[PDB]
Amino acid sequence: AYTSHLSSKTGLHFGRLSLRSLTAYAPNLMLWGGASMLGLFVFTEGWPKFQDTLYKKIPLLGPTLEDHTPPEDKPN
Amino acid sequence: WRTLVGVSHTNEEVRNMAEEFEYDDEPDEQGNPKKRPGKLSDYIPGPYPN
Numbered sequence: 001a002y003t004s005h006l007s008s009k010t011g012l013h014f015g016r017l018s019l020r021s022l023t024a025y026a027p028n029l030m031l032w033g034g035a036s037m038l039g040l041f042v043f044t045e046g047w048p049k050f051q052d053t054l055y056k057k058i059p060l061l062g063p064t065l066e067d068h069t070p071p072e073d074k075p076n
Numbered sequence: 077w078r079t080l081v082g083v084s085h086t087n088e089e090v091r092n093m094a095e096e097f098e099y100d101d102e103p104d105e106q107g108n109p110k111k112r113p114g115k116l117s118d119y120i121p122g123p124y125p126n
Contacts, residue, residue: 072086075078075116 078116090116097121 012019044050056062077094081087094114099121101112114121 069082072088073082074087075081 077114077118077120081116087116094118 041054045055051065055065077090080090085093094116097114098111099114099118101110103109
């Protein structure tokens, strides 16, 4: 057998990036999105609206965030 | 008075204690000044006017 040519064709690129790199970067990019969303969760936890929507819907750790001091003792 | 609730007295007790003092309210339709019983936002009054 003798090969006089190449069986090769140019892939898809935009100069800086190509899909060769992005098909390998995509699972770690989704993991970085998950890590950044967890960082947003921990840095915006003292927020009361996010506290009552998400951070009290957590099953076991949820009711530890509530302090139900009675309405007989609050100035406002 | 609002710092006093939840510390030494309750909210009803401080609201009943704040009524015994009079405070300067902004004047009414005619212009002459009025007095009002105190609410929880006003400060504890001193015994001497100056």
